[PDB]
Write a protein that binds this DNA or RNA. Structure first.
Ligand SMILES: [Zn+2]
Ligand SMILES: [Zn+2]
Ligand SMILES: [Zn+2]
Ligand SMILES: [Zn+2]
Lengths: 86, 78
DNA sequence: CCGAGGTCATTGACCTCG
DNA sequence: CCGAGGTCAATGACCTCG
């Protein structure tokens, strides 16, 4: 029942890890656009419901550290037939 | 200063109470479009820099319980 | 029945203005 | 500076398919 990223209520497993809805979506966005966030304070921010929204670089480091995998985000499998919809 | 409604940072007094950017806007939109929320439990919803978005009803109510009111009603575009 | 892959209203950082 | 206003990318709730 707990999001391994921020400790919020988990909605299930997203990209192979138990997380909450926002962390799920923020991972998605982060991967699909190969984002490169840079920490303001000291790249070492602890995550909670507040902080998660305050440090993108640290929210992603953790999504990653908690087992959430990028390769599962729009992998090059079929269903890449939506790409064929004009 | 400290947001009196959540403990977040405060730019200064807003609508009559040291609040944060979050709470200022929440309050404005709520009054400006006159919204009515519901709540799932009582009014007992916690609310702080972390859980303030878990229950809008209780957030607005805590805003009332510390200041604010009309004031924000600055009509549209003024 | 989960979960991938989105959609879109709400949030709140950061500005202008008197 | 302060306290109104406004902007809007990002966020996160909800939704639809596979
Ligand atoms: Zn989370
Ligand atoms: Zn950080
Ligand atoms: Zn606040
Ligand atoms: Zn409530």
């Amino acid at each position: 029942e707990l999001c391994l990223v921020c400790g919020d209520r988990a909605s299930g497993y997203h990209y192979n890890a138990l997380t909450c809805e926002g962390c799920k979506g923020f991972f998605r966005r982060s991967v699909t656009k190969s984002a490169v966030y840079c920490c303001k304070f000291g790249r070492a921010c602890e995550m909670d419901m507040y902080m998660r929204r305050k440090c993108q670089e640290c929210r992603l480091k953790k999504c990653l550290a908690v087992g959430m995998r990028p390769e599962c985000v729009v992998p090059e499998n079929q269903c890449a037939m939506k790409r064929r919809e004009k | 200063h400290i947001c009196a409604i959540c403990g977040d940072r405060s730019s200064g007094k807003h609508y009559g109470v040291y609040s944060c950017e979050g709470c200022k806007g929440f309050f404005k939109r709520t009054v400006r479009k006159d919204l009515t929320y519901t709540c799932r439990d009582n009014k007992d919803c916690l609310i702080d820099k972390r859980q303030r978005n878990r229950c809008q009803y209780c957030r607005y109510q805590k805003c009332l319980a510390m200041g604010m009111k009309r004031e924000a009603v600055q009509a549209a575009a003024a």
